[PDB]
Amino acid sequence: KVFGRCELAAAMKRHGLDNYRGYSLGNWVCAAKFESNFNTQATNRNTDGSTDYGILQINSRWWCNDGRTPGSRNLCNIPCSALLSSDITASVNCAKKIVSDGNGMNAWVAWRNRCKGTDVQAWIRGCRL
Ligand code: NA
Numbered sequence: 001k002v003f004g005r006c007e008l009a010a011a012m013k014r015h016g017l018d019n020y021r022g023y024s025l026g027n028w029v030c031a032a033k034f035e036s037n038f039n040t041q042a043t044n045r046n047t048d049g050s051t052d053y054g055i056l057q058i059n060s061r062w063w064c065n066d067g068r069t070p071g072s073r074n075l076c077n078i079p080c081s082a083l084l085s086s087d088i089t090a091s092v093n094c095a096k097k098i099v100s101d102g103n104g105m106n107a108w109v110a111w112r113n114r115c116k117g118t119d120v121q122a123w124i125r126g127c128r129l
Contacts, residue, residue, distance in 0.1 A: 001086035003038040003055070005029065006127035008088075013129055015092040021099050025129070026120035027111065028095075032056055033123065034110040040091075041084050054083035054091045056108070063094055 003011070009029050012018070018025040035057040036042035044052045050061035050069045060069040064080035076094035083091050098107050105111045 001040045003032075003040070005033075005038070005123065006129075008032060008038055008055075009124045009127050009129060011088055012092065015089065017092060017095070020096060021104065023099065023105055024121065026123040027105060027115060029123040030115035030118070030120045031105065031108050031111040034114045035108060040086055040088065043084070051080065053080045055088060056091050056095050057110075058083055058091065058094055058098070063098065 009025055012028050013025055017023075017028045032038055032055050036055045038055065040055050042054065042057065044057065046052065046059065046061070048061065050059055050072060051066055052059050053064065053066070058064060058076070058080075060066045060080050061072045063074070063076045064078050064083060065074040066080035076090075076097055078090055078094065083094070099105055101107065105116075
């Protein structure tokens, strides 16, 4: 599923991401935009052999099991393919564990490089939230 901007914001808000660990909703929408272009089926392989999955590009090195990342962890206790569903519940619940690990949203390289220090509230402007 390719989400619309406000559709995603509303779904993220419903699942409790607005101001989760202090990150306003605009941060999460900006991150999804530059990680996946709002596409739940997005995948990308990393140089170390691991793969990033879903609207928030969650990594198989630590967070999910894809059967092809040897020596990795599965800290969200999910198959990575669950992160590609049109239902973002698994992605959002896993993202809540990542952002709590001590590094905040700096865990997402796209957020640090393209969202951090910008006006992230612009990403929800015009949405009925
Ligand atoms: Na893994």
